[PDB]
Amino acid sequence: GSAVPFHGAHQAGIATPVQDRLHFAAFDVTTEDRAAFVALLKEWTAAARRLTAGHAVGEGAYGGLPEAPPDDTGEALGLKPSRLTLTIGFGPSLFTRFGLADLRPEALADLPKFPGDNLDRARSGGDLCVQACADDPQVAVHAIRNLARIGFGKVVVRWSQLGFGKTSSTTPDKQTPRNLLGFKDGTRNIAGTEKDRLDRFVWAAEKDGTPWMTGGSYLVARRIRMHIETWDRASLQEQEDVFGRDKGEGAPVGKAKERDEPFLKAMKPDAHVRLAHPDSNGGATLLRRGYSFTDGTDGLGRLDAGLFFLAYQRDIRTGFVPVQRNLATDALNEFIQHVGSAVFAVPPGVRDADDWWGSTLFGK
Q: Single out the residue of 142, 154, 222, 314 in contact with ligand HEM (rule: CB under 6 A).
A: 222
By CB under 8 A, the residues from 121 to 140 that bind a copy of itself are: 122-123, 135-138
Interaction of residue 231 with ligand HEM, rule CB under 6 A: no
By CB under 8 A, the residues from 5 to 24 that bind a copy of itself are: 23
Query: At CA 52, angle to CA 50 and CA 58, rounded to 5?
Result: 15
Contact assessment for residue 119 and residue 339, using Cβ atoms and an 8 Å cutoff: yes
> What is the pattern of x (binds a copy of itself, CB under 8 A) and - over residues 229-258?
x--xxxxxx-xx-----xxx----------
Interaction of residue 159 with a copy of itself, rule CB under 8 A: yes
Type and span of the H or E element at 151: helix 137-151
> What is the pattern of x (binds a copy of itself, CB under 8 A) and - over residues 192-231?
------------------------------------xx--
CA–CA distance, 275 with 291 (Å, rounded to integer): 21
Would you say 43 or 315 has its CB closer to a copy of itself?
43
By CB under 6 A, the residues from 289 to 308 that bind ligand HEM are: 306-307
CA–CA distance, 186 with 339 (Å, rounded to integer): 22
Give residue 142's region: left, alpha or beta (phi > 0; psi -120 to 50). alpha
Contact assessment for residue 83 and residue 22, using Cβ atoms and an 8 Å cutoff: no
Interaction of residue 131 with ligand HEM, rule CB under 6 A: no
* Overall residue count recorded for the chain in this entry: 364
CA–CA distance, 237 with 248 (Å, rounded to integer): 12
236 binds, among ligand HEM, a copy of itself, none (CB under 5 to 8 A by kind): a copy of itself
CA–CA distance, 4 with 80 (Å, rounded to integer): 11
19 binds, among ligand HEM, a copy of itself, none (CB under 5 to 8 A by kind): none
By CB under 6 A, the residues from 332 to 351 that bind ligand HEM are: 336
Would you say 21 or 277 has its CB closer to ligand HEM?
277
Maximal C-alpha separation, the chain:
70
Interaction of residue 173 with a copy of itself, rule CB under 8 A: no
305 binds, among a copy of itself, ligand HEM, none (CB under 5 to 8 A by kind): a copy of itself
CA–CA distance, 295 with 228 (Å, rounded to integer): 13
Among candidate residues 317, 303, 178, 305, the one with its CA nearest the CA of residue 243: 178
Chain residues binding ligand HEM by CB under 6 A are: 179, 181, 183-188, 222, 224, 226, 243, 245, 262, 272-273, 276-278, 286, 306-307, 309, 320, 323-324, 327, 336
